[PDB]
Amino acid sequence: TPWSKSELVRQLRDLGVRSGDMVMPHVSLRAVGPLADGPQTLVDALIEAVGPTGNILAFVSWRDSPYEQTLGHDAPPAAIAQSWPAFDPDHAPAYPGFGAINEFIRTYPGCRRTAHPDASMAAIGPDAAWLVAPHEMGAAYGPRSPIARFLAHAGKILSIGAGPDAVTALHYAEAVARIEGKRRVTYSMPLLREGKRVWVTTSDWDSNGILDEYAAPDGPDAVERIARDYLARTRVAQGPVGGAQSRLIDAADIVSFGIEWLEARHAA
Numbered sequence: 289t290p291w292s293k294s295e296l297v298r299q300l301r302d303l304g305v306r307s308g309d310m311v312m313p314h315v316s317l318r319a320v321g322p323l324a325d326g327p328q329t330l331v332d333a334l335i336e337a338v339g340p341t342g343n344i345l346a347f348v349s350w351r352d353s354p355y356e357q358t359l360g361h362d363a364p365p366a367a368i369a370q371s372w373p374a375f376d377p378d379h380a381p382a383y384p385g386f387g388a389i390n391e392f393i394r395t396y397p398g399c400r401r402t403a404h405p406d407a408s409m410a411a412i413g414p415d416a417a418w419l420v421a422p423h424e425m426g427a428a429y430g431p432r433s434p435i436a437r438f439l440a441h442a443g444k445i446l447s448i449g450a451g452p453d454a455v456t457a458l459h460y461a462e463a464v465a466r467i468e469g470k471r472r473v474t475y476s477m478p479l480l481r482e483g484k485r486v487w488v489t490t491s492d493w494d495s496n497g498i499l500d501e502y503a504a505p506d507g508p509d510a511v512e513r514i515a516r517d518y519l520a521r522t523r524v525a526q527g528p529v530g531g532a533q534s535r536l537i538d539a540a541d542i543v544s545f546g547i548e549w550l551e552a553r554h555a556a
């Protein structure tokens with residue numbers, strides 16, 4: 289029997305979600321189980337749980353991000369530069385690998401989208417515009433990014449059946465951590481500025497591992513190692529959301545732990 293919207297709202301309430309909260313969900317729909325009206329039932333429940341003054345922030349990225357196609361180049365290769373679609377924030381589908389719920393969040397009426405094609409964030413609520421902008425190339429997840437403002441607004445991270453590797457906010461911790469040998473990457477993104485496609489090439493911290501030892505693809509990254517150590521040492525509200533075991537995490541607390549975690553193991 290599929291989970292109803294009212295059943296999920298009660299579960300979110302038991303977990304500690306309050307009206308007015310700013311919540312960032314990481315969802316495994318298969319862990320949740322069948323819903324009354326598909327994934328939209330959970331989206332409606334998330335919006336009701338945070339209330340009209342609350343906010344939802346999701347890391348949705350872009351299904352057709354030219355990340356690997358322009359990685360390590362001072363400019364987009366010619367074939368990529370001539371034909372790749374410009375990132376149209378209100379029309380670009382989310383990256384499926386980060387959760388099928390993100391395409392439902394992203395198309396919700398009133399949802400705003402950041403202009404960073406690879407690190408794109410979707411936001412719903414009164415603070416949606418303030419969260420999504422600015423989001424410039426070179427500030428994917430560190431200061432001046434939606435995550436930074438999310439951390440300055442008592443944000444809560446809502447893992448719904450997702451693994452510890454899915455804590456996007458911890459990319460802020462590795463962006464500001466004062467450690468040696470932080471990996472950087474160079475890539476190009478096609479922005480849509482006043483209807484005109486503009487190619488922008490930038491450098492930023494590697495979001496696939498801030499250090500060499502954390503960047504192997506086989507392969508727990510720094511986010512997963514930090515999150516597991518945090519969840520092993522911290523009392524965190526846990527409970528069911530649908531059929532998925534869920535956690536409500538204080539975003540500023542796990543990021544502070546992440547900074548201390550990185551700086552304790554690597555010199556400055």
Ligand SMILES: CC(C)(COP(=O)(O)OP(=O)(O)OC[C@H]1O[C@@H](n2cnc3c(N)ncnc32)[C@H](O)[C@@H]1OP(=O)(O)O)[C@@H](O)C(=O)NCCC(=O)NCCS
Binds near residue numbers: 389451453
């Ligand atoms: C990796 C991960 C996404 C895999 O979890 P998953 O449950 O297997 O995959 P999803 O949550 O995206 O959803 C899968 C289900 O939704 C279905 N689905 C996809 N689009 C759908 C649609 N429009 N309508 C209905 N169902 C849809 C899929 O077909 C699948 O259903 P199925 O079992 O019948 O085949 C999850 O574990 C996770 O980590 N999510 C957080 C990811 C994240 O935020 N990463 C950030 C890193 S910085």
